[PDB]
């Protein structure tokens, strides 16, 4: 209330500060938790990519923005500021002549390369809704979120490398694609010649020679939807979340500043795929909205061999890293001898994203990536903040391994215990958030109601993770309270795995829960009730193509 006006001049004072807007806003603050009606900035008018391309021009027109790796060691690019403001120019002007208008849904299927960045910009510039799909899920997930999300046109590529081996990307957009009405606008992602059908199927590098490359910005109202993004939840199959233009751009680009603080010289490398909030938040709108040059990795961190990062990292400078706990344990699983090869001196600053951080793998990450000499920020938040929440900060003495420390300023956590009360002082409940902010997915696609009864209980937003909070108000992050999974790095839900497990004709009923497991988090233990160990790889194997390999069972337990 008087705490709200404070907020609310707080956040529109980062607002003016934080990006350009084509129309100031008349209202900062609007609704709040009790209804689910929020509304940030009211009244004013914007567009992401003019504050990611445009307004970097032309003083930074031959800067670098993107600098890209591929899984083959021998495969480099680099596009400025000035050549990715005319890609995507060009990649706006060919979606609308493929009748792509302002609020349609545009679905990218895409793996890490500078398409991927390109065909979000493209989408935000014109007002439509991108959905990016992991480029790891299967053709039959890929085609669910189709459905779901009613879009007529999909990004999508021929194929690409991860490890040794080539991933036929555009057949499974072509499975997923049979029985719907959709215009493919396909990359070329290899020298190999790929033959498509001509009606409903296009060349990315052939439209874009019919087109313009100047193209005005669509001037969108802060509440427009920007992006869906289909996430996993404890009940039910991945619901889409719903992110805005005006305060999701804001706060993702303010915590960017003021967790890593890039200057205008170097190389910010977040490593998490564009299929997941961290991707979208973290590797494209953030640091580019912030003019920061930002590294795209298209293969895995163990390929060629589990020296791969380092060698990216002295190969290109990189003086801030930001990856998950999952890539920490398996690269330290592989042996410090790895760690012997590079130099990994350009590194001023490490971060933690996406799950609890132990502290031999946080000490590891520090004493030994680091060399000592590196902040760890570990960074807490989920796909419905949209942005970063609780995190230590660089300029922070460096304590308490495992801890996410404080909020970030115009954040409120709590915790509430058993009976549904604010805990006052040190203690331990439900990590919960009091007031609205920027950046907060504002609905479920399709059902709000779903969206108020999932996350707003009593006047607070409810994380769903457990927390505790010492005597200096530090947080530490103990994970999921509910029945969503952390398996790899990755939140998946209970539900499309029992479903894609009863599918089957043999099985009638499967019920999955997450057991730990040290490289991965959580284990993946799936009971099922029909029978012999050659129907345990088929009933694996019926996950995996349902969904993605890393929602494969690990343990098939018959009943
Ligand atoms: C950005 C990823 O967003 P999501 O994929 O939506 O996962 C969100 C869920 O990951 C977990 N989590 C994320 N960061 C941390 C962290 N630093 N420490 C501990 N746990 C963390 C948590 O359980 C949260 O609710």
Not at 243 to 256: D, I, K, R, S
Not at 336 to 357: A, T, Y
Request: hydrophobic residues 40%.
């Amino acid at each position: 209330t008087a705490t709200e006006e404070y907020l609310s001049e707080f956040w529109s004072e980062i607002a003016a500060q934080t990006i350009d807007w084509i129309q100031p806003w008349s209202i900062t603050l609007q609704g709040g938790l009790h209804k689910g009606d929020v509304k940030w900035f009211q009244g004013g008018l914007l567009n992401v990519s003019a504050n990611c391309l445009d307004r970097h021009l032309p003083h930074k027109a031959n800067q670098t923005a993107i600098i890209w790796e591929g899984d083959d060691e021998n495969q480099n690019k680099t596009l400025t500021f000035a050549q990715l403001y005319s890609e995507v120019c060009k990649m706006s002007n060919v979606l609308k002549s493929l009748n792509v208008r302002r609020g349609d849904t545009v679905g990218i299927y895409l793996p890490m390369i500078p398409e991927a960045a390109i065909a979000m910009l493209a989408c935000a510039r014109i007002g439509a809704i991108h959905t990016v799909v992991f480029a790891g899920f299967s053709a039959h997930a890929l085609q669910q979120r189709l459905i779901a999300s009613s879009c007529k046109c999909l990004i999508t590529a021929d194929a690409f490398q991860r490890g040794g081996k080539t991933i036929p990307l555009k057949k499974q957009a072509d499975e997923a694609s049979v029985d719907l009405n959709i215009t493919k606008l396909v990359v070329k992602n290899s020298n190999a010649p790929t033959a498509l059908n001509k009606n409903k199927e296009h060349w990315w590098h052939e439209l874009k020679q019919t087109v313009s490359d100047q193209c005005t910005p669509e001037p969108m109202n802060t509440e427009d939807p920007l992006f869906i993004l289909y996430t996993s939840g404890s009940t039910g199959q991945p619901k889409g979340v719903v992110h805005t233009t005006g305060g999701y751009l804001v706060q993702a680009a303010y915590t960017h500043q003021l967790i890593f603080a890039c200057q205008d010289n170097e190389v910010f490398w977040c490593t998490a795929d564009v299929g997941w909030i961290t991707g979208h938040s973290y590797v494209v709108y953030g640091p580019l909205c912030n003019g920061i040059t930002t590294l795209m990795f298209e293969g895995i961190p163990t390929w060629p061999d589990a020296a791969r990062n380092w060698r990216i990292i002295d190969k290109h400078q990189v003086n801030v890293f930001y990856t998950a706990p999952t890539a920490i344990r398996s690269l330290m699983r592989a042996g410090d001898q790895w760690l012997n090869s590079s130099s990994r001196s350009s590194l001023r600053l490490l971060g933690s994203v996406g799950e609890p951080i132990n502290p031999e793998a946080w000490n590891w990450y520090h004493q030994k990536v680091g060399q000592g000499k590196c902040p760890i920020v570990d960074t807490w938040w989920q796909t419905e903040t949209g942005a970063i929440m609780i995190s230590p900060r660089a300029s922070d003495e460096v304590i308490k391994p495992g801890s996410a420390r404080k909020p970030i300023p115009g954040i409120v956590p709590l915790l509430l215990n058993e009976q549904g009360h604010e805990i006052n002082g040190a203690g331990e409940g439900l990590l919960a958030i009091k007031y609205p902010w920027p950046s907060m997915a504002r609905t479920i696609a399709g059902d709000h109601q779903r969206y108020c009864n999932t996350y707003l209980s009593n006047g607070y937003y409810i994380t769903g993770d457990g927390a505790k909070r010492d005597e200096d108000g530090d947080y530490w992050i103990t994970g999921r309270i509910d029945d969503v999974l952390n398996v790899s790095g990755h939140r998946l839900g209970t539900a499309e795995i029992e479903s894609a497990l009863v599918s089957h004709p043999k099985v009638a009923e499967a019920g999955v829960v997450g057991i730990p497991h040290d490289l991965k988090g959580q284990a993946i233990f799936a009971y099922v009730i029909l029978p012999d160990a050659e129907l345990q790889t088929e009933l694996m194997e019926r996950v995996k193509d349902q969904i993605s390999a890393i929602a494969k069972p690990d343990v098939i337990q018959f009943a």
